[PDB]
Ligand binder design. Structure first.
Ligand SMILES: *[C@@H]1O[C@H](CO)[C@@H](O)[C@H](O)[C@H]1NC(C)=O
Ligand SMILES: *[C@@H]1O[C@H](CO)[C@@H](O)[C@H](O)[C@H]1NC(C)=O
Ligand SMILES: *[C@@H]1O[C@H](CO)[C@@H](O)[C@H](O)[C@H]1NC(C)=O
Ligand SMILES: *[C@@H]1O[C@H](CO)[C@@H](O)[C@H](O)[C@H]1NC(C)=O
Ligand SMILES: *[C@@H]1O[C@H](CO)[C@@H](O)[C@H](O)[C@H]1NC(C)=O
Ligand SMILES: *[C@@H]1O[C@H](CO)[C@@H](O)[C@H](O)[C@H]1NC(C)=O
Ligand SMILES: *[C@@H]1O[C@H](CO)[C@@H](O)[C@H](O)[C@H]1NC(C)=O
Ligand SMILES: *[C@@H]1O[C@H](CO)[C@@H](O)[C@H](O)[C@H]1NC(C)=O
Ligand SMILES: *[C@@H]1O[C@H](CO)[C@@H](O)[C@H](O)[C@H]1NC(C)=O
Lengths: 163, 314, 314, 163, 163, 314
């Protein structure tokens, strides 16, 4: 949410996509290779956090016949301490993972932006709101070439440099 | 040309290092709250003790007649269970319970104690079978006839097996000194037990107690764990409940206390008194005293983990 | 045009994952070290026991005459406190202390024990009131006249209330067997106590002890917790300190041990023996044994958290 | 502390500010909307860390009459273990939070820099030390327009492109 | 591993280096001041993690003569709980530190890239794969000047702007 | 001109928050697995008890004759150690062991107990020295001649030193009541001990036990910790093993149990039964019960920390 003042609620096909507007018409198509990268990383986080322990813990209390009061107070004291430790670890873990997730998605967006920028060396100029100004009407074949990273950086240059 | 990211009209608020209430596209729960109100025992040898108390399986009251040599991966104690028919209790009872919960079951072996000069068929109406009986694994040693004395006795048992043996005996405390004389004669009675790890005699103590099952006498149950080839000896002169069979631990198991039904249709490794916790989440807010292989208990009822990007709608 | 950030001449060094001693613009402390040398009790029902020991509030030595039915949210034990006037001690004393600390106070009720055939007004000079007295909640049972025997007695108390009752009795150990005969007669004495959770008799034991308050005898204090509608019975023949009133827990409270004064001007939920820890910081380096609602104790005396940016001056 | 070889000790009005130098005169004015962002995030960290627990812990020791030696050694063993856990958690927490704070401020500075850069499309060029070279004398009205993000990216273009 | 589709296995002299190719010849020389920065930060991580505790823990068990079964089960229960806490802390610590290490090296690479980019204002143009296109044959003295950050940004300008 | 980073043909896979198996240039281990199979005692006063049991150093069986006043920074218990020569055991033995492990050694002082009217030279063949002896720090009190009675005795010891004194006495349980009469006379025997913190008498208990070292009698060992200027008294009439010397803790030390040799060539602060853990790593996967100053035990055998960048080869 940097220079992109908002998101596209109509982009139901992916996480990151393109929305062009030349003289031929309109177009909005998701970028699968960045969406799949962020999705892969979130999937990895879920694989590391959704975890099963192989450590078995046994009963040291008794709900039906209460144990000695002193040893029961030691047991309750220890259990409460461990509960505090795990509540802290859980809260901190969730907060940190969420921070890194948000920053990760933002980073993916920015790196995609600068990639498309480096594809258009001097034939385009940054507008300041996440869009690129082309100084020559790029048709839809040129659009598809921009998407799959095949647009030629010099076979459209001179024409745009004049403009 | 413009490039951007997706968004939704209604997202999920989460918490971060910086804020509390950040809208994200998608989020999932990390703290488990859904509980199955059954004991999921699919694929495990399960023994529901019911009216039999766990310690009773060693002494054998009538409610434990069918649990004298049980074998289990999962042992379930019930609230209606009872270790005794004649009123009494165990010394170091909870340690023995924790021993028996992970025992994997018990295997009994006759200790081969033979008697000459005393009676051996003490019974009572509280331990009801056909008529009046007693603990199936114990023997109530008394005097010959109309009172009379109890001779100083010494019986020895040697553990010939490669695993520790559970030995349990009992000291009888009658309702009066007159009844103690009637059963075993007058004079101070003394019960001495020794081995390699053990060294503790007991002294009886007659007197009036509150009537439990209409009876004022109490039976103290005691136990030691003999080591292989180690020998234990009892030197007793009365007020003695002799062990007839010793116990041996079968293998390994888990013990739980619950009040819900057994279900062989679901599988679970995390149990509590209210059922089974089946979850892949790392945390749970159901029961802090859950046992087995559980997610760690936390006090927060919900901790949402972000699975999507920041949500910024128009 | 140039754009940049701010800086200061003197910043604060902090530690990160990477370095130790990074200058930042601003930083704040996370480990609490400032302690208030008072017991901040503003808004809490506070009972400073002073010279009265916490357990004494159950038995009632002269220093606890004004604490027999106290009511508190916060209970303070003092170093000069004493549970006894006649020399003796409690069995399972620390468990009873921990029970009474979170009890919220105690409410006494007459147990209604009446006697025929014995004396009931035993006193001593160590429990000084007007003249020579005894524990206010107990009764020193003796024999009728010049020695003579103590008849075998059986007294029963039934808890008619919906909360567990604290029952406390005492076994007297005189300085000699001759004094034991003088008080209760010759022969072996035996005190038996039973209920539904309980099963334990006691035997006296005369002999010479070091003189505490000029006295060589000792009084063993014992206690059990009766359940509602459950009944307890005592079968005794001498050397017995009978309970006159039973105790009931009022509600909930907290217990601390301290040596600083009470202050109703400050409020605090974290207490230690040196005062009160009032802080919003998540950690503290004051007392690892602090109780209540405290920041977690850490060994580091200081951990500076960065609240500003990196400081890079000219 | 990237291309800005040092900071401005004279900037007492905010965290991030501008310092221009055209022919009209001098000027140093803080940027409130980025300073307030970093301040808001640090404030959030302090709100999450300054925290009060509602878990009450009771006495299981006794300073006036020492408890049984064995149960006291178990109690001391457990308390020492928990103390080690919380000292570790405190040190790691402080270090990680400090790292993220420093990187956060640096990130805010960089994003501000690239924002001002995108405002000046071709009418200015990067100098290499965090400053921007304007190829036309921009007066102070143009400076205030640069600050509040209203400077026109094309109504000063041709003149600067000639230079 | 952004626009640099792979790394240089032949760069044995440092972590980050230059590889130029003009008409004079070849050249690959490590950049010591960024390699030393990343190395210094990793060294700091190792200094903080390689740590010795001054907390002594005593025996509360007995391997030769087993203690009471109940107190032994409480002891084993507590020890297992603490072991779980420390295994979790160790796994999470290692994973987080590795993430921050990788992102740290990538960040150093990117910042170096943008530094060299800001040295070449208009005399060069980004190619899109981590390389820079010079529009005038820069000799090896100019290369060494580019490395030690002394290349003049305007005393080669006009010639390259024509091309 | 192009700028980039280094790479290698074969890197090391590590784990992150996101992936499991990421190749990096260089990585180092954080979990220690290398163990030294020796007790590294370089620079420490070490006492290897060997055949002497730790508790024996207080009572003094023949195997502990050279450990009666040891002084150590590091105390090593061995599996072949024994606290006793005459068969018996300690009450609260593990607490006393934990006290003696961190004691720094012991310093003995004669308690100065003198006797009139009884014998004092009880011996046995199990405690073999020149001929038949007994515990060096204890005295076996018996009756004068052919049986006869044991007079009611009262002996007092006052701790005149500024540190707590370790007091240890013994109650003899013979193989029969006939042997108990032969040693100390007929009638009930009673041993009473009291101080300021203490209050507990003992009663003997003859009977047959399994023969250990060819002997059926047992000796119960008991101990209390007197405070400075506090006085302890014993009131005994037989079956009593009197203390001749009291013990005082020297300072501070550490106690370990091991079966490996002592090495004064390596230094270490983390010990376990299999040797010494010498490491700078924060974690270890060797022994969860290691003691001293150790890396924290974890269940993972390896956790690789990245020390290099991401490895992306051609
Ligand atoms: C420990 O807590 C449980 C509930 O979690 C409670 O039932 C029990 O009474 C407590 N133990 C003692 C000794 O009060
Ligand atoms: C949203 O998160 C849930 C978590 O259970 C997941 O199952 C689902 O696939 C996610 N949806 C998308 C579109 O990623
Ligand atoms: C146990 O005793 C038997 C017979 O005396 C002997 O053969 C065996 O080796 C012993 N084993 C152990 C473990 O003591
Ligand atoms: C510096 O930090 C302290 C922390 O207590 C805070 O109160 C103060 O407002 C901060 N100062 C500035 C200028 O942010
Ligand atoms: C207690 O006893 C009274 C009278 O026998 C009875 O009315 C009441 O229901 C009982 N309550 C409980 C909880 O036992
Ligand atoms: C436990 O530690 C306290 C001090 O924190 C000390 O006073 C006490 O003696 C220790 N417990 C034992 C059993 O030594
Ligand atoms: C505790 O665990 C150890 C092994 O770590 C085991 O030898 C011991 O028997 C366990 N304690 C009990 C009471 O079973
Ligand atoms: C690789 O890591 C090890 C860790 O022990 C270190 O000793 C070594 O110097 C490192 N190598 C390089 C080239 O950094
Ligand atoms: C101990 O007693 C001696 C002699 O009665 C006395 O001088 C000394 O002050 C006392 N010290 C303590 C600590 O009780």
């Amino acid at each position: 949410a940097g220079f992109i003042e908002n998101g596209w609620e109509g982009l139901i096909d992916g996480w990151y996509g393109f929305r062009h507007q030349n003289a031929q018409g309109e177009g909005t198509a998701a970028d699968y290779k960045s969406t799949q990268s962020a999705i892969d990383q979130i999937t990895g986080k879920l694989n590391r956090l959704i975890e099963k322990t192989n450590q078995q813990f046994e009963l040291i209390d008794n709900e039906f016949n209460e144990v000695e009061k002193q040893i029961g107070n030691v047991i309750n004291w220890t259990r409460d301490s461990i509960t505090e430790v795990w509540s802290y670890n859980a809260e901190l873990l969730v907060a940190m993972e969420n921070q890194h997730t948000i920053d990760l998605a933002d980073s993916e967006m920015d790196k995609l932006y600068e990639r498309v920028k480096r594809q258009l060396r001097e034939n385009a100029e940054e507008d300041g709101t996440g869009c690129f100004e082309i100084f020559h009407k790029c048709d839809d074949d040129c659009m598809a070439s921009i998407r799959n990273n095949t647009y030629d950086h010099s076979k459209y240059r001179e024409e745009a440099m004049q403009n | 040309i413009c490039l951007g990211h997706h968004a939704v009209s209604n997202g999920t608020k989460v918490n971060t290092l910086t804020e509390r209430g950040v809208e994200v596209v998608n989020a999932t729960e990390t703290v488990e709250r859904t509980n199955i109100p059954r004991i999921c025992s699919k694929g495990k040898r399960t023994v529901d003790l019911g009216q039999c108390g766990l310690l009773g399986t060693i002494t054998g009251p009538p409610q434990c007649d069918q649990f004298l040599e049980f074998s289990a991966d999962l042992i379930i104690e019930r609230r209606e269970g009872s270790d005794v028919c004649y009123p009494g209790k165990f010394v170091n009872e909870e340690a023995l319970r924790q021993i028996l919960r992970e025992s994997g079951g018990i295997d009994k072996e006759a200790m081969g104690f033979t008697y000459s000069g005393i009676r051996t068929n003490g019974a009572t109406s509280a331990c009801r079978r056909s008529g009046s009986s007693f603990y199936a694994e114990m023997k109530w040693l008394l005097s010959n006839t109309d009172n009379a004395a109890f001779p100083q006795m010494t019986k020895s048992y040697k553990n010939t097996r490669k695993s520790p043996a559970l030995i349990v005996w009992g000291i009888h405390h009658s309702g009066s000194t007159a009844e103690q004389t009637k059963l075993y004669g007058s004079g101070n009675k003394l019960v001495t037990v020794g081995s390699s790890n053990y060294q503790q005699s007991f002294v009886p103590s007659p007197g009036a107690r509150p009537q439990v099952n209409g009876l004022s006498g109490r039976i103290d149950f005691h136990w030691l764990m003999l080591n292989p080839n180690d020998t234990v000896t009892f030197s007793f002169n009365g007020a003695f409940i002799a062990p007839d069979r010793a116990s041996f631990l079968r293998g390994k198991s888990m013990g739980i206390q619950s009040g819900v039904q057994v279900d062989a249709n679901c599988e679970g490794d995390c149990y509590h008194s209210g059922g089974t916790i089946i979850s892949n989440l790392p945390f749970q807010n159901i029961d802090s005293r859950a046992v087995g292989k559980c997610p760690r208990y936390v006090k927060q009822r919900s901790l949402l983990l972000a699975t999507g990007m920041k949500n910024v709608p128009e």
